[PDB]
């Protein structure tokens, strides 16, 4: 049910993202889309680690650059329209009552949670967020995360050169 609520909220924020043109308003629409995307990717998974990782990296880490650039880009304020708010509310109530009149068992995702797994599954009882993150720090896939940290340092070296400081 709440997965369908997040579907409806993402649809509504995407169509208002298509409608609006003010750059900080699109930045605000992105920062409120990232929360719903984080929660909706939290519904399929065993545990909410990667939603937290996407949260710190994308919203609190990266989009603040977008919010700063779009804040200094536009001198003017938002022109709030009650027509777009009314249309968003109408399509939101329509999509929630459409989720009310729809069977939620067929519309639920087939991806297993931590409790949707079998009871006799030995690997699920060990430690939360342990076996999924294991391949980051084991042979031979540790070279990718070493290359990722090197890639981030090289990215900073690129950014200092292209902005010319």
């Amino acid at each position: 049910m709440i997965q369908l609520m997040l579907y409806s909220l993402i649809i509504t924020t995407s169509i208002i993202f298509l409608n609006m043109i003010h750059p900080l308003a699109l930045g605000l629409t992105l920062l409120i889309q990232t929360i719903f995307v984080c929660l909706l990717t939290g519904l399929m998974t065993k545990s909410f680690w990667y939603s937290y990782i996407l949260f710190l990296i994308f919203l609190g880490g990266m989009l603040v650059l977008f919010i700063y650039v779009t804040s200094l880009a536009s001198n003017e304020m938002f022109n709030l329209s009650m027509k777009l708010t009314l249309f968003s509310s109408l399509i939101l109530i329509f999509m929630l009552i459409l989720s009310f009149i729809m069977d939620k068992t067929s519309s639920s995702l087939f991806l297993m949670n931590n409790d949707m797994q079998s009871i006799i599954n030995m690997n699920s009882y060990f430690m939360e967020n342990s076996l999924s993150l294991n391949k980051l720090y084991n042979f031979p896939t540790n070279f990718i995360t070493i290359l990722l940290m090197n890639y981030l340092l090289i990215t900073l070296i690129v950014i200092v050169k292209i902005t010319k400081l």
Partner: protein, 62 residues
């Protein structure tokens, strides 16, 4: 006799060229031999990952 020898050499080269064209066509039709027309798909990385996952079962403990 020089022209006879050169014609014999060129005719035998023609037969070997036709035969290797036929052999290459039958090799590319079926992708059978391991020299040409063969894409080597290896499961070395899958076996390495399976051996690592079997090795980390012993490492599981306290």
């Amino acid at each position: 006799e020089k022209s006879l020898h050169y014609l014999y050499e060129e005719n035998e080269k023609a037969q070997i060229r036709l035969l290797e064209d036929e052999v290459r066509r039958k090799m590319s039709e079926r992708n059978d031999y391991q020299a040409y027309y063969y894409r080597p798909s290896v499961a070395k990385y899958h076996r390495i990952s399976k051996e690592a996952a079997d090795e980390l079962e012993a490492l599981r403990g306290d």
